Write a protein that binds this ligand. Sequence first.
Ligand code: PKA
Length: 169
Amino acid sequence: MPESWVPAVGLTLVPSLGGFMGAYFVRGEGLRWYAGLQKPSWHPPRWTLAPIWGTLYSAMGYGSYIVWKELGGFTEDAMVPLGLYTGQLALNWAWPPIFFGARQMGWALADLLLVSGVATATTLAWHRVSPPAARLLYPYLAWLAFTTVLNYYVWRDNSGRRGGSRLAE
Ligand SMILES: CC[C@@H](C)N(C)C(=O)c1cc2ccccc2c(-c2ccccc2Cl)n1
């Protein structure tokens, strides 16, 4: 039944819901909390990147199609890659603690799950089965890349107070 593939759309929508909740914190009252925290001046509007999921959303769907092209459809072979993404992503969903509160600066946890979670699961499955699909992710690298640098600016500003010895002259 065609319904078997339909979940592919759901596969990409699922992760979007998780990241949204984390972004919702800084987006809302967190803004007040951020007043204490310093955000890089080159930081773009919150409503701008927040929509990124829309960008990754479509890519994840079409990317899976590429995998379907090689396998010829959904077969035990196809279940391993796409299935892993749904499963591995869920296990990772359990990692973030800030989702419940986020009141604490621990927001950094969103960064690790965000980047490694979405990339680690997709990379092992799609890359091996469909290397070309990895290119489709292209924007994923840029989006995740911003969080790495963006996170240091906020955390370093506060965390900078401690671990100063970590840096050399
Ligand atoms: C803090 C500014 C955020 C909203 N920004 C401009 C982003 O591009 C962004 C988008 C996201 C989308 C999904 C999940 C997370 C983010 C995070 C982010 C990065 C590190 C820690 C916490 C968050 Cl919400 N940051």
